Design a protein around this nucleic acid. Structure first.
Ligand SMILES: Nc1ncnc2c1ncn2[C@@H]1O[C@H](COP(=O)(O)OP(=O)(O)OP(=O)(O)O)[C@@H](O)[C@H]1O
Length: 529
RNA sequence: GGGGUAUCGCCAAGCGGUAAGGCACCGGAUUCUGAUUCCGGCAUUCCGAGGUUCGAAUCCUCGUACCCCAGCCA
């Protein structure tokens, strides 16, 4: 429960409504992100909990900023999260003939007019936050004149910016949005849905309330920057012949630590090629999080945990990571992979190898097991052999023993350097019966694997507040390693998360991996202490 | 000028009856993953000052801090 669900309960109880009908109205000017997922979980979640309906509506009122690629991808991500919309996909452009008719109704009532103040002059006449505005010299044209000039606008007789339709409200209102807001403006631009049928396009505040009213939306839920705009949402519906009046309720937006939500900024990261694309694993977009290894269920759990309030907030990345670690700790089958290898030969080992049994999940025997090859020459991680180390360090020291994961207790004996002080091969002796711990991969059976270790895209907690957010990009947000994985990962598929024991959760990147060389993205590292 | 918001490091419940829960953090048990799991600890106090009340985070003052609005963007 939250404040909006308490409102909906009061509405049903009082008998104001019998059903709830919500909507998610994204403009198709970019890809969806985790902030949009908070609005999807809210709107579609309420609709299914109350056995109501929720429409997907593309708020496509500005052609020069939108593209068909984005309507295809938004539909893809809404479904991926596990949500279904009511009836067909809706568009604000489906109501363009309807919106034009309601504009003519406002003109016939004298509550709208064609203004010819230039784009800079409308700002001059609008007043400021402390000073009231002033009436346009074209504000008092007759109904018959506004009708002729609006038809001329629709016919293409005016150049862009040379005229616009305005609501006649109050230029001295304390709400800047009620100081004669523009209803229509001219754009000689092709629309991804309606082609070149229209050269006049409606503004958001005129489009949104009428679109909600025609769809029978009961509770229109948007973010806090639209609280002022609610006054125009209600003025439009109180002045046209429409039978219902949807109510707008605002909640605070999601801000995530170490990342930007702004589609203007996300588009600059894509355009200037600082990330691979909109679905790059470092992106906060839904498709980026999917390719990183996040499950839809972990994102729905995140939205459930952060809540819906009116408080400005900034969630820590630790909260997001906790959600996917919880899911994947349960469902991801374990495997062995070494990200930074160093060779370890066991001089004491006799034969060409054997086959050891390893659990697909240490705390769940029902997930089964598999046979993994052991050998004399294995690969371990460099960080697990310390030539000299204190009592806290429980891994392989040049003096003592360690347990190999699910295999033998070996024992460091002699290291062998190269020339530049670095180690090339460790020499150990195993104990034929011994069945901390370190993970390993037999060199003879090792699959060569490319591992992509991701970190936060920015080096500061609020890159949005920076003067240049690009100059605060983390240079180590992607470090590519070449390691070795156990041979069973040959049958790994994209969109299947594995826990590489003692490293984290990884998944096959479906963009860079082949059969000749797999690529594993690191979704999230394990809890390191 | 107007619209909004203040409760733990971050997020959040609470609607006149004695400050839930999650993430993070500090312990301590068990583990062939420094993981998981378990156990326990984390707000005498709610933006501040005053008032009402037997009793106030809730009510009433008066202050303060922060967020949003001056696109022919959404
Ligand atoms: N960060 C966010 N947190 C919560 N809801 C959000 C967030 N960003 C957008 N929404 C909601 O999702 C819906 C669609 O947003 P929309 O597609 O118009 O993009 P936008 O982020 O609002 O603007 P822009 O495209 O310029 O970034 C709106 O109801 C909006 O309030």
């Amino acid at each position: 429960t939250n404040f909006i669900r308490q409102i909906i309960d009061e509405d049903l109880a009082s008998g104001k409504h019998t059903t709830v009908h919500t909507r998610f109205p994204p403009e198709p000017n970019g890809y969806l992100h985790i902030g949009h997922a908070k609005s999807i979980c809210l709107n579609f979640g309420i609709a299914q909990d109350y056995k109501g309906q929720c429409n997907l509506r593309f708020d496509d009122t500005n052609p020069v900023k939108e593209d068909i690629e984005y309507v295809e991808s938004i539909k893809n991500d809404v479904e991926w999260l596990g949500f279904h919309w009511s009836g067909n996909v809706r568009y604000s452009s489906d109501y363009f003939d309807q919106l034009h008719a309601y504009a003519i109704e406002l003109i016939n009532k004298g509550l709208a007019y064609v203004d010819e103040l230039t784009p800079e002059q409308i700002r001059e006449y609008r007043g400021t936050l402390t000073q009231p505005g002033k009436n346009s010299p074209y504000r008092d044209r007759s109904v018959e004149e506004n009708l002729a000039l609006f038809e001329k606008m629709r016919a293409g007789g005016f150049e862009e910016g040379k005229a616009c339709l305005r609501a006649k409200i109050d230029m001295a209102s304390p709400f800047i949005v009620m100081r004669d807001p523009v209803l229509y403006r001219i754009k000689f631009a092709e629309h991804h849905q309606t082609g070149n049928k229209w050269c006049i396009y409606p503004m958001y505040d005129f489009t949104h309330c009428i679109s909600d009213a025609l769809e029978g939306i009961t509770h229109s839920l948007c973010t806090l920057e639209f609280q002022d705009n609610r006054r125009l949402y209600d003025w439009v519906l109180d002045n046209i012949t429409i039978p219902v009046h949807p109510r707008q309720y605002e909640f605070s937006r999601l801000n995530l630590e170490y990342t930007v939500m702004s589609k203007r900024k996300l588009n600059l990261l894509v355009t200037d090629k600082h990330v691979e694309g909109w679905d790059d694993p470092r992106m906060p977009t839904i498709s980026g999080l999917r390719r990183r290894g996040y499950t839809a269920a972990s994102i729905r759990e995140f939205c459930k945990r952060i809540g819906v309030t009116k408080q400005d907030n900034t969630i820590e990345m630790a909260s997001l990571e906790s959600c996917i670690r919880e899911d994947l700790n349960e469902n991801a089958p374990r495997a062995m992979a070494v990200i930074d290898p160093v060779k370890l030969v066991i001089e004491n080992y006799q034969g060409e190898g054997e086959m050891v049994t390893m659990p697909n999940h240490p705390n769940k025997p029902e997930m089964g097991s598999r046979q993994v090859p052991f050998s004399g020459e294995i690969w371990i991680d460099r960080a697990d052999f310390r030539e000299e180390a204190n009592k806290q360090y429980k891994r392989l020291v040049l003096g003592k023993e360690v347990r190999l994961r699910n295999a033998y207790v070996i024992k460091a004996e002699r290291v062998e350097k190269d020339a530049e002080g670095n180690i090339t091969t460790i020499f150990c002796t195993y104990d034929a019966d011994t069945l901390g711990v370190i993970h390993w991969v037999s060199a003879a059976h090792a699959l060569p694997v490319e591992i992509r270790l991701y970190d936060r895209l920015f080096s500061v907690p609020n890159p949005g507040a920076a003067d240049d957010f690009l100059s605060v990009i983390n240079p180590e947000s992607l470090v590519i390693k070449q390691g070795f994985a156990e041979p069973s990962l040959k049958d790994a598929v994209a969109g299947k998360a594995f826990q590489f024991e003692r490293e984290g959760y990884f998944c096959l990147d479906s963009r860079h991996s082949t059969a000749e060389k797999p690529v594993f993205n690191r979704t999230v590292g394990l809890r390191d202490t």
